[PDB]
């Protein structure tokens, strides 16, 4: 039973995440209560960042985002001499923070207290104190620079005293574990020249692969590093049988759309070799000197060392090096029916033409039934 929660009906209509957050919030009662118990002590301390202790034991950190800036401009004494001057400068500091607050706190929803606090919202709320807070209160092996510069950090409000204007917030740093046998792979396209058209293959730009399973995985909110992707949640999407088959190497199941080609989308470098559309672009081999022609049987050209040792592509000049494990039968037969637009207006024009073609068959069917049944 752990600790069965009573009274979820008070949430009204809530999502799984909101329920989960609601549970966590009440699970945080005692800590939030304990911190807010010290609201007066906290309020009297004049500091940008200060330790929250209870009987020598630290409970958290009190931060004040405009504290130093106030200290640096406020007169050692405020009198009727100052007043107008002091109230001017102070008021502009507070008001600026207030304008910032109003960009992250806008109640539009049923349960405003359950919305996550993002890193963006955290920067606004903590100001210059954010780096200090991250640097201290996370005994981790992930650098502050990485924590600050990504979406790993996330907050939840677990307390709020309106009289003292103190907001207790719980920041969580997810400890991450690799998912075994899984890869996230990003796919780019250069143009290919297929059945007299410059085209690009239409596929997801980022997929998840585990064994024989492939799914679109456009990790959009996720934290990406060069070797790892971290998702707080999931956003995978089902791929059609055709896209799956295409991605598994049945190139006749692939879809290509015509494109306006350009230099920058006609080739890539791949560990020292070049994959280029040498039909839509001039691939000039300098050593051995020759123009690299691309047969129509090859959608793209593999320019390895056997084809060219020194290459010129417009203003680019560089040498090609050996790459192991590069294989290709390079002679693929594709059908022109694979070439089409996936633009909604274009599809609907395509559909409208089929619907029309069909109506002419439904007619012919009727003529051929009265041509029959007369016999």
């Amino acid at each position: 039973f752990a600790g069965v929660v009573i009274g979820l009906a008070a949430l009204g209509v809530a999502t799984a995440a909101q329920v989960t957050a609601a549970v966590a919030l009440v699970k945080a009662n005692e800590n939030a209560a304990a911190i807010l118990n010290l609201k007066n002590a906290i309020q009297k301390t004049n500091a940008a960042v200060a330790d929250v202790v209870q009987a020598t034991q630290s409970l958290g950190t009190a931060v004040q985002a405009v504290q130093d800036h106030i200290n640096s401009v406020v007169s050692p004494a405020i009198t009727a001499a100052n007043c107008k001057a002091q109230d001017a400068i102070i008021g502009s500091i507070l008001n600026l923070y207030l304008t910032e607050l109003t960009t992250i706190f806008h109640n539009q929803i049923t349960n405003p207290a359950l919305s996550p606090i993002t890193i963006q919202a955290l920067r606004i709320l903590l100001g210059s104190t954010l780096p200090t807070v991250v640097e201290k209160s996370f005994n981790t092996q992930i650098s502050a620079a990485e924590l600050l510069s990504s979406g790993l950090l996330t907050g939840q409000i677990v307390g709020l005293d309106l009289t003292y204007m103190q907001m207790v917030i719980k920041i969580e740093l997810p400890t991450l574990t690799v998912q075994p046998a899984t890869q996230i792979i990003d796919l780019a396209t250069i143009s290919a020249f297929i059945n007299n058209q410059e085209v690009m293959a239409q596929l997801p730009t980022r997929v998840m692969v585990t064994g024989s399973l492939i799914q679109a995985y456009p990790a959009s909110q996720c934290t990406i590093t060069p070797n790892t992707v971290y998702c707080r949640y999931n956003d995978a999407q089902v791929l059609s049988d055709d896209t799956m088959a295409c991605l598994q190497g049945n190139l006749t199941r692939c879809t290509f759309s015509p494109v306006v080609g350009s230099f920058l989308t006609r080739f890539v470098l791949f560990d020292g070799i070049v994959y280029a559309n040498c039909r839509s672009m001039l691939c000039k081999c300098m050593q051995p000197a020759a123009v690299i022609l691309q047969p129509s049987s090859s959608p793209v050209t593999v320019i390895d060392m056997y084809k060219c040792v020194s290459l010129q592509l417009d203003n680019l000049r560089f040498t090609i090096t050996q790459l192991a494990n590069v294989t290709y039968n390079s002679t693929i037969k594709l059908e022109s029916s694979q070439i089409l637009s996936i633009d909604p207006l274009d599809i609907s024009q395509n559909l409208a033409a089929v619907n029309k073609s069909l109506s002419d068959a439904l007619q012919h069917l009727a003529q051929s039934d009265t041509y029959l049944s007369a016999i």
Binding site: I6, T177, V207, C231
Partner: protein, 81 residues
Amino acid sequence: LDPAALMQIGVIPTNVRQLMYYTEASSAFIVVKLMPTIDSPISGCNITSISSYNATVTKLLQPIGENLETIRNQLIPTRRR
């Protein structure tokens, strides 16, 4: 996934990464003082700024505060959690 075939039609895998997932979360509590402390003694002066900032911020945080109390009051753990 067959990268060798994909590259023959111009599909280039530019990155191959590991997928991480969350299992345990290290936690930390923060108090944000929205009101800043003024230790300078004030005399013959009404700093009207403190007051209007207070009032406006307080109103900006009404719904959060009310949601916090509602939930604290209605959502009761049997023996937590």
